[PDB]
Amino acid sequence: SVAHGLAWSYYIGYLRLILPELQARIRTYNQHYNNLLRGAVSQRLYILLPLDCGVPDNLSMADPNIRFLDKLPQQTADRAGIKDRVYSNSIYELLENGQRAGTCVLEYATPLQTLFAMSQYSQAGFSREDRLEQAKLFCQTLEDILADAPESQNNCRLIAYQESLSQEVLRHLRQE
Amino acid sequence: SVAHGLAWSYYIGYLRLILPELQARIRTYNQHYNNLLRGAVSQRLYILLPLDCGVPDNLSMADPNIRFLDKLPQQTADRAGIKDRVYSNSIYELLENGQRAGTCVLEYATPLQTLFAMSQYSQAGFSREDRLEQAKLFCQTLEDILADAPESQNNCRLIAYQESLSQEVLRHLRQE
Ligand SMILES: COc1cc2cc(C(=O)CCC(=O)O)sc2cc1OC
Ligand SMILES: COc1cc2cc(C(=O)CCC(=O)O)sc2cc1OC
């Protein structure tokens, strides 16, 4: 199916390439700024999975209690003929009553934007019914993949939601 | 199908985002070095589509007559919560009898690597027969998409091949 391929490609072409070196990038960042407690960037990449497939480019649109703090220093690798293909990732502060309550690397799973766009292009032959069903299947397949993936054990957290996003991220950050 | 989703996501999530600003990046690069004639970087992104799905990270492995020259200055854009997500692309020289015969931005279509890996993972439930059939369908769907795409008219060239790659790229570079 469309979602099956998308979940496998997101893992193979992106998560499996960035997750093994993520915790070293986070450790280097936290150690540089001596971040401890709430200011310490979480050891996991937090992946937003909106079931409605609405993927905005600016997170401080979905919730004002989610504030951009810094870029995580880039990872580079030679990839498919791109010399030093750059992997950029952003650190956000999660606010509660105006103060920093948590810190984490956060981004949306871009294949969910593909499902939304496919439902809008006539040549994709993909309905709004297909979009919602394939969004659920994408999330489930990705969960199944990451459960067994050797690169992705203790450094990734999926956040699926339907329509407070900051409270939800903080719920996850607090558990650990 | 798996290939249908991959071709649409490669277009939606990558080509449609980089192709509108590609020719300005190439123009700025050529103008900086006053590149004219064979040394002028082609106005099109050349996308390698190996039908066997073998995607190496270093192009100077597939053919020695393909030599890395320079990185095209990066494009950045806010994307899915990644502030200034970086789009890196590499310029290659295509050699003929030891001399530079052509110059172009070149890379492999990474979703073809996903098909190869999916055929190797038991949980993907995807055979070697599925890989070859879906590789052909990916190439065909991508060709169909780019034919009508408003962002991708005169700035992209697909190079599908089965097993000289340099001669094939040069065949395309010479036509224009
Ligand atoms: C769905 O397949 C892919 C997703 C994905 C996301 C990638 C990212 O860099 C995440 C941010 C973005 O989509 O720009 S690379 C990649 C490659 C894929 O297949 C080869
Ligand atoms: C197959 O779907 C995608 C492919 C792709 C390739 C991307 C690239 O940056 C090309 C180089 C690479 O794969 O690292 S971004 C991207 C996003 C996709 O879906 C959201």
DSSP state of A41: P
CB-based contact A88 B84, cutoff 8 Å: yes
Residue from B2, B12, B14 whose mutation best tests the ligand 2 pocket (most atoms within 8 A of CB): B14
The number of angstroms, rounded, from the C-alpha of B158 to the middle of its chain's C-alpha atoms is 7
Strand-strand pairing, B82-96 and B66-79: antiparallel
* Number of residues that make up chain A: 176
Handedness of CA A147, A148, A149, A151 (dihedral sign): positive
**A4-A10-A14 Cα angle (round to 5):** 160
**Measured distance CA(B3)–CA(B143) in Å, rounded:** 12
User: Who contacts B140 (Cβ-Cβ below 8 Å, separation ≥6)?
Assistant: none
Which alpha helices (H) appear in chain B, and where do they start and end?
2-10, 16-32, 111-120, 128-148, 165-174
Resolution value in angstroms: 1.7
What DSSP string runs through B8-19?
A: HHHIIIIIHHHH
CB-based contact B81 A48, cutoff 8 Å: yes
Q: Which residues of B121-150 are buried (b: 16+ CB within 10 A; e: fewer)?
A: eeebebeeebbeebbebbbebbeebbeebe
Q: Which residue, chain included where needed, has tokens 């989610």?
A: A66
Residue A70, φ and ψ in degrees, nearest 5: -160, 165
Neighbours of A94 (CB within 10 A): 26
Ligand 2 binding pocket includes A111 (Cβ within 6 Å) = yes
Ligand nearest to the CA of A79: 2
What DSSP string runs through A105-167?
A: EEEE-THHHHHHHHHH-GGGT--HHHHHHHHHHHHHHHHHHHHH-STTSSSEEEEEE---HHH
Chain A partners of B55 at a C-beta cutoff of 8 Å? 80
From the CA of B111, how far away is ligand 2's center (Å)? 7
Neighbours of B26 (CB within 10 A): 25
**Measured distance CA(B161)–CA(A33) in Å, rounded:** 50
**Measured distance CA(B48)–CA(A61) in Å, rounded:** 37
Chain B partners of A48 at a C-beta cutoff of 8 Å? 81
Cβ–Cβ under 8 Å, residues B92 and B68 = yes
